[PDB]
Short mmCIF file of all heavy atoms in Angstrom, two decimals:
data_model
loop_
_atom_site.label_atom_id
_atom_site.label_comp_id
_atom_site.label_asym_id
_atom_site.label_seq_id
_atom_site.Cartn_x
_atom_site.Cartn_y
_atom_site.Cartn_z
N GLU B 151 -11.71 8.81 8.19
CA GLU B 151 -12.21 7.49 7.81
C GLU B 151 -12.10 7.22 6.32
O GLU B 151 -11.86 6.07 5.92
CB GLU B 151 -13.68 7.38 8.27
CG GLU B 151 -14.32 6.03 7.95
CD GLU B 151 -15.14 6.05 6.67
OE1 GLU B 151 -15.30 7.13 6.08
OE2 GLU B 151 -15.63 4.97 6.28
N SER B 152 -12.25 8.25 5.48
CA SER B 152 -12.41 8.06 4.04
C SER B 152 -11.14 7.57 3.33
O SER B 152 -11.25 6.92 2.29
CB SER B 152 -12.88 9.36 3.39
OG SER B 152 -12.07 10.46 3.79
N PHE B 154 -9.02 5.25 3.95
CA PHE B 154 -8.73 3.83 4.01
C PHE B 154 -9.34 3.10 2.82
O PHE B 154 -10.51 3.31 2.49
CB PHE B 154 -9.26 3.22 5.30
CG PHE B 154 -8.37 3.45 6.50
CD1 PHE B 154 -8.11 4.73 6.95
CD2 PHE B 154 -7.82 2.38 7.18
CE1 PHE B 154 -7.30 4.95 8.05
CE2 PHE B 154 -7.00 2.59 8.28
CZ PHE B 154 -6.74 3.87 8.72
N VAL B 155 -8.54 2.25 2.17
CA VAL B 155 -9.02 1.42 1.08
C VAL B 155 -9.41 0.06 1.68
O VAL B 155 -8.55 -0.77 1.96
CB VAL B 155 -7.98 1.29 -0.04
CG1 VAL B 155 -6.58 1.04 0.52
CG2 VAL B 155 -8.38 0.19 -1.03
N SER B 156 -10.71 -0.13 1.89
CA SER B 156 -11.25 -1.37 2.44
C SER B 156 -10.60 -1.70 3.79
O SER B 156 -10.13 -2.81 4.02
CB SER B 156 -11.09 -2.53 1.45
OG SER B 156 -11.70 -2.22 0.21
N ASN B 157 -10.58 -0.70 4.68
CA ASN B 157 -10.15 -0.85 6.06
C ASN B 157 -8.66 -1.15 6.19
O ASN B 157 -8.25 -1.88 7.09
CB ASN B 157 -10.97 -1.94 6.79
CG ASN B 157 -12.46 -1.68 6.73
OD1 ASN B 157 -12.96 -1.05 5.79
ND2 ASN B 157 -13.19 -2.16 7.73
N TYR C 220 -19.39 5.67 -0.13
CA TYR C 220 -18.97 5.90 1.25
C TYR C 220 -19.96 6.88 1.89
O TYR C 220 -20.10 8.01 1.43
CB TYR C 220 -17.55 6.46 1.32
CG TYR C 220 -16.49 5.43 1.66
CD1 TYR C 220 -15.77 4.78 0.67
CD2 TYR C 220 -16.18 5.14 2.99
CE1 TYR C 220 -14.79 3.85 0.98
CE2 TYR C 220 -15.21 4.21 3.31
CZ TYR C 220 -14.51 3.57 2.30
OH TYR C 220 -13.54 2.66 2.63
N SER C 222 -19.82 8.45 4.71
CA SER C 222 -19.18 9.61 5.32
C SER C 222 -18.85 10.67 4.27
O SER C 222 -19.25 11.83 4.40
CB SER C 222 -17.91 9.19 6.06
OG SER C 222 -17.04 8.45 5.22
N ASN C 223 -18.12 10.28 3.23
CA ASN C 223 -17.68 11.23 2.22
C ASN C 223 -18.82 11.61 1.26
O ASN C 223 -18.80 12.71 0.70
CB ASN C 223 -16.46 10.66 1.50
CG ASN C 223 -15.64 11.72 0.79
OD1 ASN C 223 -15.97 12.91 0.85
ND2 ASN C 223 -14.52 11.31 0.20
N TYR C 227 -17.86 6.04 -5.92
CA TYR C 227 -16.54 5.63 -6.42
C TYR C 227 -16.70 5.00 -7.80
O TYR C 227 -16.96 3.80 -7.93
CB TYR C 227 -15.88 4.68 -5.44
CG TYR C 227 -15.36 5.32 -4.18
CD1 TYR C 227 -16.20 6.04 -3.33
CD2 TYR C 227 -14.02 5.20 -3.81
CE1 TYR C 227 -15.72 6.62 -2.18
CE2 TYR C 227 -13.54 5.78 -2.66
CZ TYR C 227 -14.39 6.50 -1.85
OH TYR C 227 -13.91 7.07 -0.69
N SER C 288 -12.81 -0.84 -4.34
CA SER C 288 -11.97 -1.86 -3.73
C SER C 288 -11.14 -2.56 -4.79
O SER C 288 -11.57 -2.70 -5.94
CB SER C 288 -12.82 -2.89 -2.96
OG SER C 288 -12.00 -3.94 -2.45
N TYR C 289 -9.94 -2.98 -4.39
CA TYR C 289 -9.08 -3.72 -5.29
C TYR C 289 -9.71 -5.08 -5.62
O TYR C 289 -10.29 -5.71 -4.74
CB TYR C 289 -7.70 -3.94 -4.66
CG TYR C 289 -6.84 -2.69 -4.63
CD1 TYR C 289 -6.74 -1.91 -3.49
CD2 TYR C 289 -6.10 -2.31 -5.75
CE1 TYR C 289 -5.95 -0.78 -3.45
CE2 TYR C 289 -5.31 -1.17 -5.72
CZ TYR C 289 -5.23 -0.41 -4.57
OH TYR C 289 -4.44 0.71 -4.54
#
Side-chain angles (χ1 to χ4, degrees):
Chain B
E151 181 263 354
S152 50
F154 279 62
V155 44
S156 303
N157 305 28
Chain C
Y220 259 95
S222 54
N223 200 1
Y227 286 58
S288 176
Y289 286 98

